[PDB]
Amino acid sequence: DLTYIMLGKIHLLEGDLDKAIEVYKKAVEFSPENTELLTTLGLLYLQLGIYQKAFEHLGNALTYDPTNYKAILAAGSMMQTHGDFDVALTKYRVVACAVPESPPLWNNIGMCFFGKKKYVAAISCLKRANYLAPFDWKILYNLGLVHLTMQQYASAFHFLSAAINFQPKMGELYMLLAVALTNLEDIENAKRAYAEAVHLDKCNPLVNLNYAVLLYNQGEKKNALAQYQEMEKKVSLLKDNSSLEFDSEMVEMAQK
Amino acid sequence: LCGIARIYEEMNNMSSAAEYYKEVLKQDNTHVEAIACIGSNHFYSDQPEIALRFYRRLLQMGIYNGQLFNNLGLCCFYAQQYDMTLTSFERALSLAENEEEAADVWYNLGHVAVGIGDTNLAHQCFRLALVNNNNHAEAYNNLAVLEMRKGHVEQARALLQTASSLAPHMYEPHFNFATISDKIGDLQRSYVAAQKSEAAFPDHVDTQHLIKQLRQHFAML
Amino acid sequence: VKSMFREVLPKQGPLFVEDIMTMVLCKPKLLPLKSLTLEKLEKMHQAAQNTIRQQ
């Protein structure tokens, strides 16, 4: 068994996971009772995009051992991607008396309260993570996102711009930071910050082109429908473009 | 009532200490040394807004130190009040008594600079805390996490090597040695490193996920 | 027709999927406030150097 995961260490380090799964698919075959081989297989299915098999393998690890901390957060993340927020905290409360200070744990419980609209609870819970781990990719982007929902626009510039410095190549941080600017008055910076936003992605997201029409709504008329028809077709995504389509109904209303 | 809550902080009995300091504030609402020791025990454990209220009031008595404009600078940042957060530091850099004292105000300014994300700014905040005062053990560790973010491994592993020898307590260089010296592979020094990160602070989580990570390697394959 | 003001936020975040062993920093410290005996005894001792600087 120990010869397997060092071989599994190779294909993740050099590159893709697709050949690395078959190393673990041999590994689960020889020992279907070990929880450590199952849990690493569960995260590997989830990075591929789940085909519901990852939900099965974690439960095998959970019944064979119910207190493994790495197993809980995966199923803690797995339930939380759909709903079941009240179910998610019941899983999380098992481990919170064992790892009382974990910043990946305290980010998730902060994000779980964001589903149940306990808005003032989440900032009091997320900021226990940002004290404990001062620079992260994910804690800072979560902490800035709850402020724009709470319309506390001046504080949200501080956290959103604090995560650009730690990983510059993101698209959606540049998308939200521009919305943090238009509630302030830096419209000169707003067109500049949006200019780096539309360039850094080039294939995946469609929300920021719906942001292109709102900046273009003020004092501009030509390239509105050019931005609106830009990448209108989605290749393969389950994101909520329908709530944007209500806003895009107002976008096509400007040009009709 | 101040003498009884002072021996409880010696044993760290803050479950029964900070109730008595709520009595020396019940009557005698201007005792100075029981205003900070509540307004500090709220800044930790995530009440950074209530802890500010105990420090703006202590300003209005009119004491005007340099140490207070440090503490007033830290509470406004963590409570997200961005106006008084930094003018209070420039007044704290000035009117500082000793040259060893202006180090600590540069050092707390570094934790501000990590909060905005600027590391180039943050790299020269701990440095100026270090040139204004050597043997500042909390900055040697803190400077060489910023080094390991860049890649200077052998530079970082000597600053933690001398942060530990200045503070033979305070678990944070000892545990941080055993995640540099574990990724390389030296599992003998990375044991005695993570040995002292248990004796100087037990009930740590990520030490107990590291000694049992090492003691599986020591028995057999 | 007053304004659209529709800036739809994603309503989702980057959940963690595992813990990572990382390096953590020293935490920021609040400086103590010296007592009125320590303020007096330092002021007396600071003047004790200047009277021996001339003698």
């Binding site: 200070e101 004290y131 404990l132 | 760290n12 803050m14 900070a36 020791c37 307004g39 500090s40 025990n41 800044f43 930790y44 454990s45 503490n71 909390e138 307590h169 305070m170 944070e172 602070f201 | 953590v24 020293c26 935490k27 920021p28 410290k29 609040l30 103590p32 406030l33």
Partner: peptide, 15 residues
């Protein structure tokens, strides 16, 4: 305001 033993900090130890 911030001490437990030989001038150690807090909020990463406890309380």
């Amino acid at each position: 305001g911030i001490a437990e033993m030989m001038l150690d900090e807090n909020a990463i130890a406890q309380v």
